């Protein structure tokens, strides 16, 4: 089997991308953020408290005649930007694409955080990691991914993000079409529950490429991309006017200006990220200074690849016995 869904940036932004997701029967189509940096897929609900809903389409399990509540399951998640949500559990029918799995977990929010109250336009998200870190217990529960893999004609999925534009993520299948060049592999670590790899190097504009590695996560839940200071200082001393800012929590720089590229290594190939991905936009409303889309990882301990560095490539999570990652250029 295969499955294809088309992803959409929420606004002009491309502060987090949805994907339609059926659940349910009859289905109830919901918006999720599909996350590769985590590993439950939970909704709004008919269970969620009233005040703490203001827009998302929710997932009502009474009207399914497919769920389940799993007796006595319970999840609770907390990110680093202090954001959570919690509730219960149902198996119901999920479908993506046209990929369908029967008994999916889908954990149904019965509070969730301001951050994600005020986000009208993503009723929950659909992890991607690895199901290690699944929050449900005292049992926890398989990714899309895990439970659709078998079935699968190939055993990965890929994110195609556009920059200001739909894009498409894949099951099953590696769309040749949707790239340039080839695709280069490389080695993932799965021993903390993540697309963890390692990056050869980086090149700020036309600048010299600069070997040494940069182990990170692959995450299409996280906008930006989050690098060694060392990195950061060196991307930002190309542009005039920007600096750190303490008050605003990163780099910001003048909106007038016209932003270097940033390159990756994977192995020996290159993904060019261009300036105007970078751009973030005013601070405030109406502020003539714009927010940087690298910023320092330095307090996170771990590197993030998230959606600004994605989007400039065709991205295949490879689910194999030995996972892989894959970057093509596009
Ligand atoms: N107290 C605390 C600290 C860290 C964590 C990891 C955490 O937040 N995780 C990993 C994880 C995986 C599985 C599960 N069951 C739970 C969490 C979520 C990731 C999911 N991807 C999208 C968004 C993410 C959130 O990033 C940020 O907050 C952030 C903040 C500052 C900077 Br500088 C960069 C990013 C990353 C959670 C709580
Ligand atoms: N300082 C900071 C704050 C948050 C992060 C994570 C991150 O990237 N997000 C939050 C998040 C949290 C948890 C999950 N599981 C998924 C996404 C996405 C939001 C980022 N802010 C822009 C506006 C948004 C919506 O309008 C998108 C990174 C750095
Ligand atoms: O804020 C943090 O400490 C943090 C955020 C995201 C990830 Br992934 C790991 C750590
Ligand atoms: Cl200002």
Known sequence: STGSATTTPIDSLDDAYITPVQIGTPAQTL?????????????????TTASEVDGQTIYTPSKSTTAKLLSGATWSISYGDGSSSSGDVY??????????????????????????????????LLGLAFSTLNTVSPTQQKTFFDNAKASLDSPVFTADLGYHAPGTYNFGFIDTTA?????????????????????????????????????????????????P?????????????????????????????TLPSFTFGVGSARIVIPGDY?????????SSSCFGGIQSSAGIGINIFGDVALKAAFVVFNGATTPTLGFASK
């Not at 592999?185 to 790899?197: D, H, I, L, N």
């Open 91 to 124: 198996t119901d029918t999920v479908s993506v694409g046209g990929l369908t799995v029967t008994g999916q977990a889908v954990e149904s929010a019965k509070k969730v955080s301001s951050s994600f109250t005020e986000d009208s336009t993503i009723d929950g």
């Open 31 to 47: 918006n999720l953020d599909f996350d590769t940096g985590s590993s439950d897929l939970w909704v709004f609900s008919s269970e």
């Open 229 to 257: 200071a060392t990195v950061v200082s060196a991307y930002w001393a190309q542009v005039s006017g920007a600096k750190s800012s303490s008050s605003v929590g990163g780099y910001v720089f003048p909106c007038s200006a």
């Open 278 to 286: 970078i751009d973030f936009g005013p601070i405030s409303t109406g």
């Open 179 to 227: 790239y340039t060049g080839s695709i280069t592999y490389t080695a993932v670590s799965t021993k903390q529950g993540f697309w963890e790899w390692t990056s050869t190097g980086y090149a700020v504009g036309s600048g010299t490429f600069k070997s040494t590695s940069i182990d990170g996560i692959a995450d299409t839940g996280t906008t930006l991309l989050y690098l």
